[PDB]
Amino acid sequence: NMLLNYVPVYVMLPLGVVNVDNVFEDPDGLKEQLLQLRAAGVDGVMVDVWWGIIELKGPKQYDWRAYRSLLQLVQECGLTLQAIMSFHQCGGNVGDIVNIPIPQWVLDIGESNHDIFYTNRSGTRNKEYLTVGVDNEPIFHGRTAIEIYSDYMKSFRENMSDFLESGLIIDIEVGLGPAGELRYPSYPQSQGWEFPGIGEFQCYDKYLKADFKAAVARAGHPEWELPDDAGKYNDVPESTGFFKSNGTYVTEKGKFFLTWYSNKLLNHGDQILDEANKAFLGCKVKLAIKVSGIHWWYKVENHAAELTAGYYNLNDRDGYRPIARMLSRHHAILNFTCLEMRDSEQPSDAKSGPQELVQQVLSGGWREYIRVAGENALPRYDATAYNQIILNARPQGVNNNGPPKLSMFGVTYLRLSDDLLQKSNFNIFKKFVLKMHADQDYCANPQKYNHAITPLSPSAPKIPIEVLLEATKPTRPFPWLDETDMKVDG
Template identity: 50%
Template structure:
């Protein structure tokens, strides 16, 4: 218990009125501390409090001619409590009845690096012990990332699932369930990342020759965290589009782990849709200097997204709109500091509304395409995706 110095002084200088009549109905510290006294603070017993005998005695003050009996109080507010307020204190906390409410399954996320870059299960004995602990406390299952950069690391369409096979078998034998994440982004550099898992090596090689496969900001800085949505339909990945690469990966997973789908061990597949697996632009990269609460920057300056923007602007009859805003600030700007986002700014003009509608529609179209392919690959399985709604991350579940 933390007690302020002022309460020490009160208990040492003036004896306090006994509160036994108020708190007698509470048989435990939990009940006592949670009683609702309509805003009145009820301090818990302190080793510095005087004995009950001393508390019940009135204090005497000598003014030189007569003695005046004064009843002591604790801190002042207690004497303002009416009899009705004291009578309103419930004798005990009500017990909540959860019967009839839907069951909520509980899944625990495994460490990001439970599988190493060689697709080997790290410390299987230690992991088995941890899984048994989870089983003993009635956890339903675990969630694990299946990293694109590990499974298809060296050669296109050459998939190595060995470490995941051992992990899934271990989970199945303990009669736990699995939620599996199709992770098409790199791991490392973001909040909570404790390992580094890059995109596949063959993708990085393509990126060195053609860096436009990555999201790009106004200054030309590339972000290799995930592929730009501008190449969803561009055959720039050894003859395949990005959508075809994602689908081939998901289909390989579905075929490889068919038995775990059939017996219900895999209960959900969460599909990565962007940076950190989330359906959003990588607008606030720490590696490029962004710090909270900066507004970030638009990420539409690779040649493929700019080509898409040009087509959209020409379709509207305004080819000169084929550009990003030039007054939207930088990563650490505040909205009121920019001509685009400030009150009455360009965001609400004809061009601003056009650009923002196009920018957001590219995001929506990407999510729709990838999830449609996931539904095809995992027919009959619950599919999930991480999206932003109202400034918070949400896991949205879709029944396939």
């Protein structure tokens, strides 16, 4: 059945649907837009549940009213919802319309303790998210950062108990860093970064510096210090001592730092997912995380952009499969991106390989037997972009006698706006939805398209770091079709 080949399509809501004052401003305008999405066959929508809005009043002071109103409207429209536990800042760069910083009471603490923020070698602090260095430091009026995220999700589960009961919310995406992604804020626009800069390492706050200092001493190398020859945000690999040919990144010291640096993210995600499993135990929802798509410099030996981000990915070291294996124990979904990008669309000087990157991440996930979903990186309204998404949603096409050989769990499109609703753009979008649905009409019963809806089970036993790292062994990705068999046109 083509219904077994049906992949659900979700649409990201406009930023600030619930404003910084914690008010659901334009119910009527959003409703008009949602009714049209529903008419296009869209399965559901996605929304950031901003930490900066909900717990703004003060510690453990949660106001869910406006959001409950938003969820009530989504339900009345007959759409499902993907909720992002957004523990990061919204916008923040010159040009961003909607700016939602993390809670002010947290920023106040930051004023007297600048090390709660991610920090570069030059000492600049990024206030968009709390460094992994304070995940377990009880410096937030008694609570650790992880306890903050844990109490937040629990209050959400309790206050949204009816919506979770009704099956409105189908999955909870746990924000794990800048832009909600599990990574270091290595390419900040606010600090001058410009594509395709290699970015900078962000492990200099006192907490991680002490962490690294203890780690090297145990390795019997107290003389090793954090990186000092990595260059800056906009440099290119070969112009640095760390990333150039036979540079520091290939030394015993370099490889130890990179392993230490990337492991912090694996554990950061594992610990926080543990709390999410506890918070949502028994609810009919799936957990998920967002992995960033660093496609620039993917084409060269150093993979510099990925390394400073926290993904220790090299020609001979799979830096992504270990993340998938970590997600295994939580039965979580790996939400990726760059689904609409083609290498031909990137400037050659960027040494960009989004197509190859998507293939590696998706293949890794499927090898670890977890679900993989994804989004488009940049706004696109053209057929060429949609065809690439459809290709990635079912790499080996449709299967006439059963579910597809390979297929993403779902796709979330960025982003709902009036431009998407313009006649020309919308008519192409409607075709994209149809194709993602394998030429079938919207279907309300997930069973019809192989999406088992079950109560969240407790996490499986902890997987030791060394076992997770066995997944760094290089493996050939699954073969991909060159062009999809379900083009929006022919």
